């Protein structure tokens, strides 16, 4: 319940990708399914993701962190990529299930 | 009035060929000066503990 | 090589002769410095202190 | 002391070369570090912007 | 017209490898060591070659030739200690490189990672055979123990170990074989490193964030050539400190006595960069089990990519995984220390616990922790 | 050729008076041009081009546009 | 590897088992012949005449 929410928020703060302005779905490993999901993103979301990732890379190059008020809040972190990734994974699972028989 | 660094660039660093010659001539003088200084430091630290400092007693 | 026997190449040479001469001096100074020729380094005022 | 010399006949020369290399490295590391900083200032000072026409 | 750098075949290769290679803009100093490794390799090839101009691989003239290099050859001691401490620097850089690969999820490059594992095996074999060349007490007896390990292989162990020995034990045949293999192997290492770079450049390089950096790629030359030059300068500073102030810091003194097949030295241990493996080797009381554990302790890098259960590639945003990684590093340090120490009451149990912890962390704790982290992020 | 037409001549007159303070006759322009030779061109280009920091503006698919360090390095010759 | 758990894959294994067994026999015979094992070659009628 609220205990799980508290530990999840603590972990989100500890995993400092919000300190770089990134969102959770910007840090996922770009395997084949994630690449296909990115390919299906609408143009605005793709551009926003590209800029956020580039800014994070610049910050890590300078070994610096975004101002405290610019960190991505846990409650306002939107999982934009999750639906597309889920759809791609379902399609892959369907293809594999067909291949089994 | 141009600064010393401005003079250096205009006369020596502007053209790479002159830039190379400055380095080559500089390396010649630097090696002699640096070795002479470094040897002096080492010999001063170890004064009286080297053969060159005690040979006179046994030489000749 | 008559292709290069023209007035422009004569002008081209004169433009690059000072540069080539400068690089030659770098090679000459470098060779003397690297090998410690001492046929030439004896003349050099401060370097001749060594040997 | 004689046995020390026998085991390490290069002791003194080794120390001398170490002093020279210490001086040269203390001279060079800041210089090459400054050259790296000079090359990298273009990226370190760069300022990115995002201007979606929307 | 065209550009010679981008047109000429050799120039094309060089330009696409080290001049116009798109490289991530945020790779930290941990990405220097790769180039450092190459530097080390080249050094070991050069320095070692100049040791081969005075070293003879006969048991009657091996130790004497090494002393001739150290006493009579002009600057021979410089070259000898450059080689000896450059092997140690090579292994420091190798361990840091493997740690960087583990931490930042660089093992997802399957072909590059596997070629790296083969390189690690080859470099370890090269160093082991090279340490025998001085033919001191430590060289002879460490060679004896490590080769006798092979006798634990069932059925063909004795024939294999005797074939490698060239006789019934470590003797002149073994010394000459090891000199030849030690001479030849680094060139195979260079070929494997070229193949390694070939595989790496197929997908570019990873970055500390673990996120694809195609949006923020920079030319390799003006930035990372000077950065790698600075890293090589710092590495050369450390190596020259070792060579000129503590040349014998990383070498056991007992290797300065000529090999005595009839008398063991007070303590027998390999070079430090093997001690950890040695520790694991001694954790298992069984000979065959010990050899298998030793082999697995390095073959586990092959399994590493298949154990990656995290949605994120780099441990940068995985604090629990960071804790596990640093536990693994401390465990490896403990294994090295125990391998240095003798086999007595506390050291046996601490080494067994350390080996169990190493395998548990790599095989069990890390994937479970990654799954827990995935749950905490609601992946 | 640029001074063919009443409008170009008026534009030239006005711009010259604003900038030069005077109308430069074509004879003076021709004299200044005739003063130019290869040595003058080399000297002036070296003054304004050789080993100078440029200002660059890119727009569009400019991913291949060389990095500013590479362009600056291109602004001088190692052979020279 | 649950992707490879299905009736089609079992059919594939059935199809390729004879080929895998033949290749294993090839490997075993090659190993015995190359090493001159003599643990197996003693049984072979004409070959065991050697040694
Ligand atoms: C990755 C490459 C190499 C590594 C890691 C390596 C490592 C070593 C090590 C640890 C030693 C023991 C030195 C001592 O105990 O004093 C050694 C000795 C030696 N190595 Fe290398 N080596 C490499 C490449 C080479 C190459 C390419 C050559 C020849 C072309 C070479 C020739 C020798 C010789 C002759 C010795 C014996 C001389 C001596 O012990 O002082 N090595 N090597
Ligand atoms: C003689 C041995 C080796 C040499 C000469 C060598 C050389 C290099 C070089 C030059 C790079 C590119 C620079 C860099 O990424 O830092 C590199 C990257 C890499 N190496 Fe090696 N390496 C060696 C051993 C290894 C080992 C032992 C491993 C793993 C067990 C390994 C795995 C990798 C990986 C995964 C990368 C890519 C990392 C990334 O791009 O983020 N290599 N290596």
From TrEMBL, chain A:
Record carries keyword Secreted: no
A GO CC term attached to the entry: mitochondrial inner membrane
Membrane topology label: Peripheral membrane protein
Keywords annotated in UniProt: Electron transport, Membrane, Mitochondrion, Mitochondrion inner membrane, Respiratory chain, Transport
Signal peptide residues on this chain, from the entry's feature table: none
Highest taxon, organism lineage: Eukaryota
An individual GO BP term: mitochondrial electron transport, ubiquinol to cytochrome c
Localisation: Mitochondrion inner membrane
Keyword Disulfide bond: no
Major location (coarse): mitochondrion
Self-association and partners: Component of the ubiquinol-cytochrome c oxidoreductase (cytochrome b-c1 complex, complex III, CIII), a multisubunit enzyme composed of 11 subunits. The complex is composed of 3 respiratory subunits cytochrome b, cytochrome c1 and Rieske protein UQCRFS1, 2 core protein subunits UQCRC1/QCR1 and UQCRC2/QCR2, and 6 low-molecular weight protein subunits UQCRH/QCR6, UQCRB/QCR7, UQCRQ/QCR8, UQCR10/QCR9, UQCR11/QCR10 and subunit 9, the cleavage product of Rieske protein UQCRFS1.
Similarity comment text for this entry: Belongs to the UQCRB/QCR7 family.
Task performed by this protein: Component of the ubiquinol-cytochrome c oxidoreductase, a multisubunit transmembrane complex that is part of the mitochondrial electron transport chain which drives oxidative phosphorylation.
PANTHER family tied to this protein: CYTOCHROME B-C1 COMPLEX SUBUNIT 7 (PTHR12022:SF12), UBIQUINOL-CYTOCHROME C REDUCTASE COMPLEX 14 KD PROTEIN (PTHR12022)
Protein name: Cytochrome b-c1 complex subunit 7
UniProtKB/TrEMBL annotation, chain B:
Family in the record: Belongs to the UQCR10/QCR9 family.
Any GO BP: mitochondrial electron transport, ubiquinol to cytochrome c
Domain of life the protein comes from: Eukaryota
Task performed by this protein: Component of the ubiquinol-cytochrome c oxidoreductase, a multisubunit transmembrane complex that is part of the mitochondrial electron transport chain which drives oxidative phosphorylation. The complex plays an important role in the uptake of multiple carbon sources present in different host niches.
Pfam family, one: UCR_UQCRX_QCR9
Subunit details: Component of the ubiquinol-cytochrome c oxidoreductase (cytochrome b-c1 complex, complex III, CIII), a multisubunit enzyme composed of 11 subunits. The complex is composed of 3 respiratory subunits cytochrome b, cytochrome c1 and Rieske protein UQCRFS1, 2 core protein subunits UQCRC1/QCR1 and UQCRC2/QCR2, and 6 low-molecular weight protein subunits UQCRH/QCR6, UQCRB/QCR7, UQCRQ/QCR8, UQCR10/QCR9, UQCR11/QCR10 and subunit 9, the cleavage product of Rieske protein UQCRFS1. Component of the ubiquinol-cytochrome c oxidoreductase (cytochrome b-c1 complex, complex III, CIII), a multisubunit enzyme composed of 3 respiratory subunits cytochrome b, cytochrome c1 and Rieske protein, 2 core protein subunits, and additional low-molecular weight protein subunits.
Membrane topology qualifier: Single-pass membrane protein
Protein name: Complex III subunit 9
Major location category of this protein: mitochondrion
This protein's encoding gene: UQCR10
Automatic annotation (TrEMBL), chains C, G:
Pfam families named in the record: UCR_6-4kD
Cited InterPro entries: Single_a-helix_sf (IPR029027), UQCR (IPR015089)
An annotated GO cellular component: mitochondrial inner membrane
Gene3D superfamilies found in the cross-reference section: 1.20.5.220
Key words of the record: Electron transport, Membrane, Mitochondrion, Mitochondrion inner membrane, Respiratory chain, Transmembrane, Transmembrane helix, Transport
Transmembrane segment boundaries: 20-40
Record flagged with keyword Lyase: no
Subcellular location: Mitochondrion inner membrane
Topology term for the membrane: Single-pass membrane protein
Primary residence: mitochondrion
UniProt-listed GO biological process terms: mitochondrial electron transport, ubiquinol to cytochrome c
UniProt keyword Metal-binding present: no
Family: Belongs to the UQCR11/QCR10 family.
Subunit structure: Component of the ubiquinol-cytochrome c oxidoreductase (cytochrome b-c1 complex, complex III, CIII), a multisubunit enzyme composed of 11 subunits. The complex is composed of 3 respiratory subunits cytochrome b, cytochrome c1 and Rieske protein UQCRFS1, 2 core protein subunits UQCRC1/QCR1 and UQCRC2/QCR2, and 6 low-molecular weight protein subunits UQCRH/QCR6, UQCRB/QCR7, UQCRQ/QCR8, UQCR10/QCR9, UQCR11/QCR10 and subunit 9, the cleavage product of Rieske protein UQCRFS1.
Protein name, as recorded: Cytochrome b-c1 complex subunit 10
Protein source organism: Sus scrofa (Pig)
From TrEMBL, chain E:
Residues that bind heme b 4: 80, 83, 182
Pfam families according to UniProt: Cytochrom_B_C (PF00032), Cytochrome_B (PF00033)
Cofactor binding notes: Binds 2 heme groups non-covalently.
Gene Ontology MF term list: metal ion binding; oxidoreductase activity; quinol-cytochrome-c reductase activity
Annotated binding of heme b 1, by residue: 31, 34-35, 97, 100, 106, 196, 205-206
Binding residue positions for heme b b566: 97, 196
Swiss-Prot/TrEMBL keywords: Electron transport, Heme, Iron, Membrane, Metal-binding, Mitochondrion, Mitochondrion inner membrane, Respiratory chain, Transmembrane, Transmembrane helix, Transport, Ubiquinone
Residues the entry annotates as binding ubiquinone-10: 35, 201
Regions that span the bilayer: 30-52, 81-103, 115-133, 140-158, 178-200, 221-245, 288-307, 319-340, 346-368
Residues that bind heme b 3: 44, 80, 83, 182
Cofactor(s) the record lists: heme b; heme
Cellular compartment(s): Mitochondrion inner membrane
PANTHER family (UniProt xref): CYTOCHROME B
Subunit details: The cytochrome bc1 complex contains 11 subunits: 3 respiratory subunits (MT-CYB, CYC1 and UQCRFS1), 2 core proteins (UQCRC1 and UQCRC2) and 6 low-molecular weight proteins (UQCRH/QCR6, UQCRB/QCR7, UQCRQ/QCR8, UQCR10/QCR9, UQCR11/QCR10 and a cleavage product of UQCRFS1). This cytochrome bc1 complex then forms a dimer.
Protein's name according to its UniProt entry: Cytochrome b
Protein species of origin: Sus scrofa (Pig)
């Amino acid at each position: 319940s609220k205990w799980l929410e508290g530990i999840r928020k603590w972990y989100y703060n500890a995993a400092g990708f919000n300190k770089l302005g990134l969102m959770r779905d910007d840090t996922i490993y770009e395997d084949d399914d994630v690449k296909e999901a990115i390919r299906r993103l609408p143009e605005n979301l793709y551009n926003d993701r590209v800029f956020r990732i580039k800014r994070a890379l610049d910050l890590t190059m300078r070994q610096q962190i975004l101002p405290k008020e610019q960190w991505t809040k846990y409650e306002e972190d939107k999982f934009y990529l999750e639906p597309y990734l889920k759809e791609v994974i379902r399609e892959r699972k369907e293809r594999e299930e067909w291949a089994k028989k | 009035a141009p600064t010393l660094t401005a003079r250096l660039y205009s006369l020596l660093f502007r053209r790479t060929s002159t830039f190379a010659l400055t380095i080559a001539v500089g390396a010649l003088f630097f090696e002699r000066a640096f070795d002479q200084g470094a040897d002096a430091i080492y010999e001063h630290i170890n004064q009286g503990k080297l053969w060159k400092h005690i040979k006179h007693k046994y030489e000749n | 090589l008559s292709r290069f026997l023209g007035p422009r190449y004569r002008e081209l040479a004169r433009n690059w002769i000072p540069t080539a001469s400068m690089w030659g001096a770098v090679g000459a100074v470098g060779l003397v410095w690297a090998t410690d020729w001492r046929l030439i380094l004896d003349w050099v005022p401060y370097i001749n202190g060594k040997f | 002391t004689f046995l020390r010399w026998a085991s390490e006949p290069e002791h003194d020369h080794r120390k001398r070369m170490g002093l020279k290399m210490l001086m040269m490295m203390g001279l060079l590391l800041p210089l090459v570090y400054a050259m790296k900083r000079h090359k990298w200032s273009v990226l370190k000072s760069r300022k990115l912007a995002y201007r979606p026409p929307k | 017209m065209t550009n010679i750098r981008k047109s000429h075949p050799l120039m094309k290769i060089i330009n696409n490898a080290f001049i116009d290679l798109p490289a991530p803009s945020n790779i930290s100093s941990w990405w220097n060591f790769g180039s450092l490794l190459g530097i080390c390799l080249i050094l070991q090839i050069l320095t070692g070659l100049f040791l081969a101009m005075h070293y003879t691989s006969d048991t009657t003239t091996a130790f004497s030739s090494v002393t001739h290099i150290c006493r009579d050859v002009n600057y021979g001691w410089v070259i000898r200690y450059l080689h000896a401490n450059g092997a140690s620097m090579f292994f420091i850089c190798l361990f840091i490189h493997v740690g960087r690969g583990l931490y930042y999820g660089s093992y997802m490059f399957l072909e590059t990672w596997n070629i790296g594992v083969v390189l690690l095996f080859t470099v370890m074999a090269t160093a082991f055979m090279g340490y025998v060349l001085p033919w001191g007490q430590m060289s002879f007896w460490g060679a004896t123990v490590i080769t006798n390990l092979l006798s634990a292989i069932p059925y063909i162990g004795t024939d294999l170990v005797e074939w490698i020995w060239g006789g019934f034990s470590v003797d002149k045949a073994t010394l000459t074989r090891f000199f030849a293999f030690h001479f030849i192997l680094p060139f195979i290492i260079t070929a494997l490193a070229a193949v390694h770079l070939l595989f790496l450049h197929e997908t570019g390089s990873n970055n500390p964030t673990g996120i694809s950096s195609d949006m923020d790629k920079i030319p390799f030359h003006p930035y990372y050539t000077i950065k790698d030059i600075l890293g090589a300068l710092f590495m050369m500073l450390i190596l020259l400190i070792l060579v000129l102030f503590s040349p014998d810091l990383l070498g056991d003194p007992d290797n300065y006595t000529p090999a005595n097949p009839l008398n063991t030295p007070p303590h027998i241990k390999p070079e430090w960069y093997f001690l950890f493996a040695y520790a694991i080797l001694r954790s298992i009381p069984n000979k065959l089990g010990g050899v298998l554990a030793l082999v697995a302790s390095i073959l586990i890098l092959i399994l590493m990519p298949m154990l990656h259960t995290s949605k994120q590639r780099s441990m940068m945003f995985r604090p629990l995984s960071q804790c596990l990684f640093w536990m693994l590093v401390a465990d490896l340090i403990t294994l090295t220390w125990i391998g240095g120490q003798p086999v007595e009451h506390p050291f046996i149990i601490i080494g067994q616990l350390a080996s169990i912890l190493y395998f548990l962390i790599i095989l069990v704790l890390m994937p479970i922790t990654s799954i827990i982290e995935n749950n905490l992020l609601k992946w | 050729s640029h001074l063919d037409g009443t409008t170009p001549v008026c534009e030239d007159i006005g711009r010259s008076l604003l900038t030069y303070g005077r109308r430069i006759p074509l004879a003076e322009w021709e004299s200044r041009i005739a003063e130019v030779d290869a040595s003058v061109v080399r000297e002036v280009c070296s003054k304004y081009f050789y080993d100078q920091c440029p200002a660059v503006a890119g727009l569009g698919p400019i991913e291949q546009l060389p990095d500013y360090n590479r362009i600056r390095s291109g602004m001088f010759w190692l052979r020279f």
